RNA sequence: CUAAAGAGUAACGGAGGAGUACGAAGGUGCGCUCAGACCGGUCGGAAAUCGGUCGCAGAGUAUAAAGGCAAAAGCGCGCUUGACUGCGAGACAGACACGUCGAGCAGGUACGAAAGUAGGUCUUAGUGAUCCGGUGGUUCUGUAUGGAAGGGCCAUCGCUC
RNA sequence: UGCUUGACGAUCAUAGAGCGUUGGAACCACCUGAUCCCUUCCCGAACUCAGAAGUGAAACGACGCAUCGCCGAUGGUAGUGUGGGGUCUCCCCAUGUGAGAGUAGGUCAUCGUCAAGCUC
């Protein structure tokens, strides 16, 4: 990919001599980015569920799979087994191609870019971020948009402690605070 | 309730199996292979009203 | 680990070889080699074995389908000599496909009934 | 009035009372205790009366524990009702007492005061009791 | 609202104890679940009936990684 | 539960359920492992979907409880009809009538590469004798004879009897 | 001669867990790539295939340690068969039996078949 060889040849030798690691493969590495969309309002209409496939596939190039409720909640109008979301997983060079597109091309075109939270870590080196709205991704067409919807990004890395996670994330030139 | 049905052999024999069936959820007729002891072959049986 | 999920994936067939008192052609598959044991019904004794660690198979390719054919044909020769003809093929949780299938197919042509 | 405040079953079999109370026979918590030397039942009304007699006498200072809980429901047939036609309906709650069970405990008071307050409580109770000090093992 | 019902006793339990001679087909245990498990020469019925598949003597054994009580037929 | 550690065991004793369901929720091969908690994450909140750690069955098992459940007996997918026909050694249970389990043999299948597995469903409720009448088969009988009627035999239907 | 590694068993915690140290010659694992066989209700994550550039980081194996877990006496106690007795809702005596809990303590397993390497 455009970013895969960058990590393989320059970021990895940068981190090993930066984190003071005695092994080569101990360096934190992004394993996958998965894109979830919590599909609300599907309690009454299903026209949005295959609309979600349309936008989610185009910004990733992979066909998403529709998720279903693990339980039945009275507070919301959903029951076990209805489609209430979509998700995509990227691990190949497609994983790296999306990362550069989101980092350099997509992220700048947002309403109010105050950076990204640096404390947004689970505590085990995995970074999670959420996109407030759509149309940040250039792939879609604004005219050909049924509704305006968000989605979230999860950087699942092999880092042990979240300080390694931010170190690798900053090595990607991630805009933080 | 589950009303009784008759699975009648496709062969020339008058052999029939009997079973029940939910006639609202699945109103389509049952077609299934069962052993016909008259011709000693596995044969398709078709649902008929008992 | 994915080794634990494989052994428990192989438990049912192995427990079925016992309670049947059948001689088992156990198979192990690695990234570098592929093995084949002919284990007694009790499971605690091996009657014949063949791997890519044999003198005639250490050199050259060992972790491909071709090496599986040579090992499977070899274990058929040793099993017949040991006095074993009717076995049951244990895939040991490995999918019956590719190398594992090639080893078994060689034993089928080698004179092992399974 | 002590009650389990909810139960799995409303009614219980009468059962028996045969032990020697090898558990609940030590003075934990406090330093002086009222120990049952005989065997019987303690209703919730009796336990409360003994509690009130005991607490009123150690006025202004002390800590008191109730180590007897009436968790056993006891039924009664009404008057003018024949045998049969069901068990009968819970009337009160009792605690089964074996000899040796510690019923009440106190601390923060002198031994002379503790004996005085335990005599007051023991007169409300239908069992033979005794005064015991906390022991090392 | 009231009571007074019960079902018939099922006559479950061990029919042949340890060391008893068995013929093939003899019912060894009647049970609800598998309180006892089928060892060597012992079959399992639809209702988890343990029955003899071979002739021999009953052997009860507890063994395995799960602590299952087994019924086996030995010579 | 009472029920007294084999079985059984009464009370107008203490508590709950049943009078069904499913051609898939059956068979098989393959594959998987729940509940809950915490942390991070757009709407999203205690709780929706996503990722990670713990968790190790506290979930699930059509349904009441009890006993079971890793070869999961729980969950998914592909192909299917073994929810087969004749039987059946041997048992359990038992006043009788009924009832339960079942290796194995034959015929014919399904799934699997194969060993194998499958005669319904994790198990234990979901039921009603005979008579009479109806329907489908039948090499049986057929009141002088040939038929037929009617009868018998096998399958099956009609009782909140 | 013994050791190491791997596969399959015996046994099923005195065997487990946790923590720490160590192993890459071989084995194994991670690993490289995905056209080929095959796979994802998306994704070479898993499954599969062709390999050997890299590493023992993860996992696994070995070693150590009583922190947890597990095991656990002796003595006593409870219960209890039979015979007898009392103050008989419950106990006692003779005789036979005898826990559970707890205490002292113990445990970082033991064994077998086969294959490869090494040692002697
Ligand atoms: Mg009994
Ligand atoms: Mg008894
Ligand atoms: Mg949340
Ligand atoms: Mg929360
Ligand atoms: Mg089920
Ligand atoms: Mg005539
Ligand atoms: Mg007729
Ligand atoms: Mg790989
Ligand atoms: Mg290490
Ligand atoms: Mg102990
Ligand atoms: Mg003891």
Curated annotation (Swiss-Prot), chain A:
The organism's place on the tree of life at top rank: Bacteria
GO molecular function (one): structural constituent of ribosome
Coiled-coil regions listed in the entry: none
Any Pfam family matching the protein: Ribosomal_L5_C
CC per GO annotation: cytosolic large ribosomal subunit
Entry keyword set: Ribonucleoprotein, Ribosomal protein, RNA-binding, rRNA-binding, tRNA-binding
InterPro entries linked: Ribosomal_uL5, Ribosomal_uL5_bac-type, Ribosomal_uL5_C, Ribosomal_uL5_CS, Ribosomal_uL5_dom_sf, Ribosomal_uL5_N
GO terms under biological process: translation
Function of the molecule: This is one of the proteins that bind and probably mediate the attachment of the 5S RNA into the large ribosomal subunit, where it forms part of the central protuberance. In the 70S ribosome it contacts protein S13 of the 30S subunit (bridge B1b), connecting the 2 subunits; this bridge is implicated in subunit movement. Contacts the P site tRNA; the 5S rRNA and some of its associated proteins might help stabilize positioning of ribosome-bound tRNAs.
Quaternary structure and interacting proteins, as annotated: Part of the 50S ribosomal subunit; part of the 5S rRNA/L5/L18/L25 subcomplex. Contacts the 5S rRNA and the P site tRNA. Forms a bridge to the 30S subunit in the 70S ribosome.
NCBIfam families in UniProt: PRK00010.1
Similarity comment: Belongs to the universal ribosomal protein uL5 family.
HAMAP family recorded: Ribosomal_uL5_B (MF_01333_B)
Protein name in the entry: Large ribosomal subunit protein uL5
Swiss-Prot record, chain B:
Entry keyword annotation includes Nucleus: no
Keyword Disulfide bond: no
SUPFAM superfamilies assigned to the protein according to its UniProt record, in alphabetical order: Zn-binding ribosomal proteins (SSF57829)
Superkingdom of the organism of origin: Bacteria
Keyword terms: Ribonucleoprotein, Ribosomal protein, RNA-binding, tRNA-binding
GO BP: any one term: translation
GO annotations of cellular component type: cytosolic large ribosomal subunit
Record-stated family: Belongs to the bacterial ribosomal protein bL33 family.
Note: Surface exposed on the 50S subunit.
Protein name: Large ribosomal subunit protein bL33
Swiss-Prot record, chain D:
Protein's UniProt keywords contain RNA-binding: yes
GO MF annotations, alphabetized: rRNA binding; structural constituent of ribosome; tRNA binding
Pfam families, per the entry: Ribosomal_L16 (PF00252)
TM helices/strands, residue ranges: none
GO CC aspect terms: cytosolic large ribosomal subunit
Listed InterPro entries: Ribosomal_uL16, Ribosomal_uL16_bact-type, Ribosomal_uL16_CS, Ribosomal_uL16_dom, Ribosomal_uL16_sf
BP GO terms, sorted: translation
Keywords: Ribonucleoprotein, Ribosomal protein, RNA-binding, rRNA-binding, tRNA-binding
Record-linked Gene3D superfamilies: Ribosomal protein L10e/L16
UniProt xrefs under SUPFAM superfamilies: Ribosomal protein L16p/L10e (SSF54686)
Subunit comment: Part of the 50S ribosomal subunit.
Record's function text: Binds 23S rRNA and is also seen to make contacts with the A and possibly P site tRNAs.
Family: Belongs to the universal ribosomal protein uL16 family.
Protein name: Large ribosomal subunit protein uL16
The organism of origin for this protein: Pseudomonas aeruginosa (strain ATCC 15692 / DSM 22644 / CIP 104116 / JCM 14847 / LMG 12228 / 1C / PRS 101 / PAO1)
Swiss-Prot record, chain E:
Keywords: Ribonucleoprotein, Ribosomal protein
Ribonucleoprotein in keyword set: yes
Keyword Transmembrane helix tagged: no
GO molecular function: structural constituent of ribosome
Top-level taxonomic group: Bacteria
Cross-referenced Pfam families: Ribosomal_L27
GO term, biological process aspect, one: translation
Gene Ontology cellular component list: cytosolic large ribosomal subunit
PANTHER family attached to this UniProt entry: LARGE RIBOSOMAL SUBUNIT PROTEIN BL27M, RIBOSOMAL PROTEIN L27
Family, per entry: Belongs to the bacterial ribosomal protein bL27 family.
NCBIfam families recorded: L27
Cross-referenced HAMAP family: Ribosomal_bL27
Name the record gives this protein: Large ribosomal subunit protein bL27
